[PDB]
Request: fold
Amino acid sequence: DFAKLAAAQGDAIDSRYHPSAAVRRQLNKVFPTHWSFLLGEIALYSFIILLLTGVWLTLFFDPSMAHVTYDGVYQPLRGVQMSRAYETALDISFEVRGGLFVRQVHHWAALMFAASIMVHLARIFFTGAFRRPREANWVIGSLLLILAMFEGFFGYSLPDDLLSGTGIRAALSGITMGIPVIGTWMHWALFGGDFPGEILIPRLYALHILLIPGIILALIGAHLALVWFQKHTQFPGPGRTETNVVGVRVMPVFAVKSGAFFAMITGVLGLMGGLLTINPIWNLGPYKPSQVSAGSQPDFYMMWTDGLIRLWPAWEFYPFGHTIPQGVWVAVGMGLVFALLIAYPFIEKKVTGDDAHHNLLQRPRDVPVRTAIGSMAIALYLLLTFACMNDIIALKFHISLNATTWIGRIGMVVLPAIVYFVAYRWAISLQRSDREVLEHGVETGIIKRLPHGAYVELHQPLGPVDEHGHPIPLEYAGAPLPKRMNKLGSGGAPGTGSFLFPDPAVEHEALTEAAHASEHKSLTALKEHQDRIHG
Amino acid sequence: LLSGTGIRAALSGITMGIPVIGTWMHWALFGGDFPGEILIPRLYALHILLIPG
Amino acid sequence: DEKRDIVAYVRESAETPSYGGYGLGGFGPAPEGMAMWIIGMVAAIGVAMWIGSRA
Amino acid sequence: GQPTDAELAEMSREELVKLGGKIDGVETIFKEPRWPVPGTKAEKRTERLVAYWLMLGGLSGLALLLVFLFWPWEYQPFGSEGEFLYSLATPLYGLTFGLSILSIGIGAVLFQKKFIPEEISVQDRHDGRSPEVHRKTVAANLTDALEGSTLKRRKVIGLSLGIGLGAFGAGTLVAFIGGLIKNPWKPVVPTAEGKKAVLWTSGWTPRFKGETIYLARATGRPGESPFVKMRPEDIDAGGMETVFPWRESDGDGTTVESEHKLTEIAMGVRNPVMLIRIKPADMHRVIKRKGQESFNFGELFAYTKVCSHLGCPSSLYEQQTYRILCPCHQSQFDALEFAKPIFGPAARALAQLPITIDEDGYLVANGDFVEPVGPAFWERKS
Amino acid sequence: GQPTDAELAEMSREELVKLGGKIDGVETIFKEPRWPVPGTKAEKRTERLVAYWLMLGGLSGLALLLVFLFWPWEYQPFGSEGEFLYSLATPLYGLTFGLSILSIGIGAVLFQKKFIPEEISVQDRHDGRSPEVHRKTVAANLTDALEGSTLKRRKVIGLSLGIGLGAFGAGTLVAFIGGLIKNPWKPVVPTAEGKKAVLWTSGWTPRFKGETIYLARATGRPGESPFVKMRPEDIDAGGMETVFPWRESDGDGTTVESEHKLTEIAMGVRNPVMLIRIKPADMHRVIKRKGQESFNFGELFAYTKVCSHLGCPSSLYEQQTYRILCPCHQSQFDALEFAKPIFGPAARALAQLPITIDEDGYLVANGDFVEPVGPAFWERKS
Ligand SMILES: CC(C)=CCC/C(C)=C/CC/C(C)=C/CC/C(C)=C/CC/C(C)=C/CC/C(C)=C/CC/C(C)=C/CC/C(C)=C/CC/C(C)=C/CC1=C(C)C(=O)c2ccccc2C1=O
Ligand SMILES: CC(C)=CCC/C(C)=C/CC/C(C)=C/CC/C(C)=C/CC/C(C)=C\CC/C(C)=C/CC/C(C)=C/CC/C(C)=C/CC/C(C)=C/CC1=C(C)C(=O)c2ccccc2C1=O
Ligand SMILES: CC(C)=CCC/C(C)=C\CC/C(C)=C/CC/C(C)=C/CC/C(C)=C/CC/C(C)=C/CC/C(C)=C/CC/C(C)=C/CC/C(C)=C\CC1=C(C)C(=O)c2ccccc2C1=O
Ligand SMILES: CCCCCCCCCCCCCCCC(=O)O[C@H](COC(=O)CCCCCCC[C@@H](C)CCCCCCCCC)COP(=O)(O)O[C@H]1[C@H](O)[C@H](O)[C@H](O)[C@@H](O)[C@@H]1O
Ligand SMILES: CCCCCCCCCCCCCCCC(=O)O[C@H](COC(=O)CCCCCCC[C@@H](C)CCCCCCCCC)COP(=O)(O)O[C@H]1[C@H](O)[C@H](O)[C@H](O)[C@@H](O)[C@@H]1O
Ligand code: HEM
Ligand code: FES
Ligand code: FES
Reply:
């Protein structure tokens, strides 16, 4: 009697505790059903998969520089001195059943985590979800992005590899020693000595499996709690206002679709871990200061920092008996990048004057200057990433390596400007298109007038039509406009039988008019609620 | 010496004496025989992240 | 002898199948990041567009 | 406007759901089932579709189980029967797992989009500026806690608590971080000129005056005799060889005392050097640095491999251009001239090792680098 | 019974605190200040007392800082000038830190107990069985979510989702745990009788038929020649020596190839053995096990050190009692008889190594243990 068991368990729960009101509030919480609001969930799900795979990895990983000869199964690396970290990474790859798959899905989850964090940041920035109520949310999310970047750095640096080791040597060691007053001291504190200090990988292992994941988990908890209680913002729409949330309740629909989305994201990541090879360390010999490779790139989320290193033009200053190497330039650049990213909402409000409580998102077209600035920043980030990749770009796409370096150097001040101008004008022209639709109706096929030979596109008005043909223009309300009669009530009733065979006409008619009734009922309910809010 | 002797007693002997799956649990935990080269890394994971979490 | 060993390694690395799926060229970070951003992120975003709504 | 003391008994499920929405500020508008018409076969087809997706997920999960338990996993040497099975083993694990969970997710999404009823529930958002009753009551509670405590009236306690907390925090933070803090300039590495700091000294620093440091070539032999003495004739015009600072005392790796000295030589960050043979025809284009004019032994030039910018090895030697390129950040150093950077982030030249030949003709270092060899840092160029 | 729309403006702090308590179900009774009478000098003394405690905390925190920054820390070898300072270095760190924070805590407690007003606030506890409105509305919401979803009507979906989730969970759990699951009885250790399991084989198992396994004494020499061949004359009546299975191939630890075989010998769980010289007077009290009657060489008996119960070494030896005691759980084995347990948790006798002397008189195992030597397990005694 599962129904009786459920009832008895509910009564016992509500007697021991009293979660009825709280649970009802959680279940009844309404979440907007916009697709772009799942971008953060992608990052959350990738993070969960990262935790689950990282536990498995830690069950088999040994962090240490203790030198050992492999003497494993992988023949191409036998008798070669390597760190125990590399040896156990190879053991995960080969000796452990499914260890290669687990580590590959872990790395793919890391890449998807960074990518989805970037996409979510783009969504919120361009939609203006950081304004008065949620600047703190933006700030903690920026800290979260920085932590994710650096944890991925430490994660692919954990198995001491040739690629990851040379990346560490460059970024960490060089840029740390570069810092003027405390650079060498920071280097010695972090590595416990010179660069190959025998505590580096244990320290990174701790930072990567316990410390940084703990901070990220706490910050994700704060992030999700803030989103939960500062009810999720929404785009302007029929019944959507600054003081309501139009969407679906948590329990019946949102919970089911979020769980299913998590399942599908897990499936995508597992499929990638299977079919796509990620970081094949066995091809990469154990780290040695002398051995190198041509590629020498970090993961894509640090590729922009590496590209900054490459592109910045070797400007070194030599104060009285001292040196200020080119690494400090990039250190300051990264500092500026993070500072501006964290402080943008406050910069935005200082610049514009907006101190209003904003609960309705802005369309990126509707906010041109911010959209232009975001496009400019994305262009700069892409230029830096492809500058880091300039080695492989030059190799495959036959471009001189010097040519790619200087393309990056010039474009990091030219391409941002071009993209800013283009994005600003593009946003304004999207606004112009929206107003054209508002004032003339949707466009359709052309018709030749009866008496004379005029051609008229035979538009379709979206609002009340004047006594004559031309309609009364509507007022823009911040919501997208249907520019195709495709997406309106036109040409949308295929035979509802099946792909290969029809259904009885009675069934088809019943279904089609039932759907018509349901959709017009939804439209009428939204219209009535909209009229009720002010009217 | 002290703590490794304690491990050898409890974790190894008790685990490996269990009738149906004792040796299997011992080998799964230690990656092999008692002094298996993964015991302390596994305990480190368990002790800094997994169990404290 | 050393040159023969290098030749053997070159041939082995050239003819060795990529363990753990399609080997995206041989360059790790750049092909892997591109494959993420295309395959994984287009899949995720398209699935999000399917599940959610446009408005 | 009443809590429905006894009407809940006869209130139906729909009425109770509406009441809950009302209490929570949620008004459910157009909660309509997906299949109002009963008995239609389109409903059965959609049912079968979601069932097929869930069953595909289950079959793929069973496939994951079966392939994981029974498949030719385990590394297979090159060109051996079973290599193909091993190569597509992990792909099969990932394919089965991902397909299973993806199909389950697709089935769940289809159930939500086809069977779970459609709603446009609208929740009243009470964001911002809690009602004045709550605000003023919280303010009163906090202010009463602060003032009643009699703080901001015991000046001595106010200052003493601040001093105590500040001193304790200072002591605790300093004791937390002093374990990590180390002096980079503590003289530790022994040298002919007494113990010196690590950054100044590399494997090429003479431990005692007049020590012989051979430019030993690092044969890839796994462990035994990894470094072997070197002769100028071994290199030929337009050739580069990575050499290391090997000492007679640092004999082959057969012993345990050795194979730690050799490991230290191999792992020395500032140890590896590139010995390049400048072509005799191109020897006339060489421009030499101050104090490094006699460093080259005839047409042999020894430059540190560590890039002068962030310290990656600069191994990519290009002959017929005499350019030592670094792969980490694409910086070229003109080997013909003193190895000065002529492109890329680097701004300082690579340190040039003084080389010569000892008795028996083996290549040895004729001294130490006249400058620190790794990447630059604050305490440099003086 | 009204929310005080505009009364809050003139409501005082006490009234607002009472209102908040009322809203939260909290009635603050007897919230009285500690010092109603003003100007008294007992108040000043108490103020100064809490101030003194906080100032002691601050002074001790500064002491922690100064001691940590400037104290002769670092190990001092032994009987060395500075050894006394080092010995109380860490105690001083702990003393200063603990005293500082303890004094801060004492000051805070005294401030709470002497200055913060005393209250006996009583909160209304609404525990158990949320009001029927909430219970029934939650039940209605959950039941509407379940039934409206149309589940428990699509038997094919109900069963398919269960099958899919179960299969996926099975596959995922098996894939998670199969990396760990290893077969204890995979024949890996080579032996004269082919590869055998690790539990069956020890360091005393002859790798090839007729192999010589000397009972090498483990000298404490740090690294070089750790194991040295042994002779019967070395022990004297009532003597115990810990010996290991040393092979001629496992030469001294000078080489890298050696010092790994030797490390394996030292770290072998079942390798160490105790060689006991039974006193000739007491040799007549010896009882011998089935198949172990000729194992002893004259008055030499070689018993495994690993205790038969949980595998700790049984290193303690009592002569004139001939009792091999295990420190882990106080089990005694009668060495005179076959090393059968005559006390403690152990129930199986220690395995007896056959021993003899080869040419030159060096002690060598005359075979292998006729039983598994470590602690017992399921697959044993057959
Ligand atoms: C710092 C910086 C950006 C310097 C400039 C270097 C650079 C990126 C130059 C452009 C590269 C191109 C497009 C070369 C083709 C020749 C060329 C320049 C033609 C004119 C360009 C032009 C305006 C054309 C008009 C039409 C048009 C837009 C054509 C674009 C054609 C292309 C290539 C579109 C895709 C863009 C693309 C993928 C560029 C390469 C970027 C990267 C990082 C690829 C990474 C990558 C590599 C490198 C693999 O080898 C690989 C192997 C196996 C699996 C995966 C991969 C993989 O993902
Ligand atoms: C970026 C932004 C919105 C900034 C707001 C303005 C602001 C506050 C600026 C202050 C900070 C500064 C100084 C910024 C300038 C430069 C900058 C952004 C530095 C920080 C870099 C950083 C930590 C985060 C930026 C992340 C971000 C928003 C990236 C763009 C993400 C978006 C919208 C992607 C499009 C969605 C989509 C379908 C992507 C997949 C399709 C493809 C292939 C897109 C192109 C593409 C991309 C996008 C890659 O990332 C990539 C990485 C590695 C190899 C290849 C590729 C590649 O081909
Ligand atoms: C060889 C080998 C070892 C292979 C294995 C690889 C490995 C090591 C690890 C991965 C293996 C595993 C365990 C994979 C499965 C992972 C997993 C649990 C998937 C669940 C997805 C699934 C099976 C769905 C079935 C379809 C279905 C009926 C769905 C509806 C019921 C379900 C499952 C609902 C789940 C809801 C869900 C995702 C809850 C997440 C809980 C968390 C952390 C946060 C909740 C939460 C969410 C989700 C928000 O979106 C949100 C947005 C704004 C503000 C706040 C929140 C918020 O608090
Ligand atoms: C959900 C995940 C779905 C992922 C799809 C997975 C794809 C499966 C691929 C096939 C099965 C696995 C193959 C494993 C074995 C294997 O590795 O595959 C090579 C082939 O490789 C190639 O050429 C490329 C062939 C082109 C088809 C594959 C392209 C798929 C890309 C597009 C997927 C990533 C997305 C990137 C988007 C990019 C656009 C950005 C806008 C084949 O040998 P070969 O061809 O000879 O490789 C040479 C050595 O020999 C030789 O030494 C060596 O030196 C080389 O020359 C080497 O090429
Ligand atoms: C407000 C606090 C004011 C005090 C600031 C103290 C920092 C200045 C140091 C002053 C004394 C320096 C000379 C005497 C000492 C000396 O000679 O040592 C030196 C290195 O100074 C040390 O000792 C440890 C430094 C202590 C950590 C300082 C942390 C920074 C402070 C400023 C931040 C916290 C303060 C609160 C403000 C923030 C509030 C938050 C809002 C060199 O090391 P070395 O010769 O190699 O020996 C190594 C042994 O030291 C080493 O502990 C050991 O680990 C070994 O590794 C060994 O190598
Ligand atoms: C939170 C975000 C995380 C990110 C972005 C991340 C990223 C990464 C990446 C990219 C790798 C390289 C994997 C490879 O090269 O095969 C890695 C390795 C590793 N990760 Fe993480 N990780 C995260 C969380 C965790 C957690 C929570 C744990 C522990 C529970 C963990 C444990 C490990 C271990 C042990 C390794 C080394 C395994 C190996 O070398 O193959 N990671 N990480
Ligand atoms: S690391 Fe060599 S030029 Fe930058
Ligand atoms: S361990 Fe020896 S008696 Fe228990």
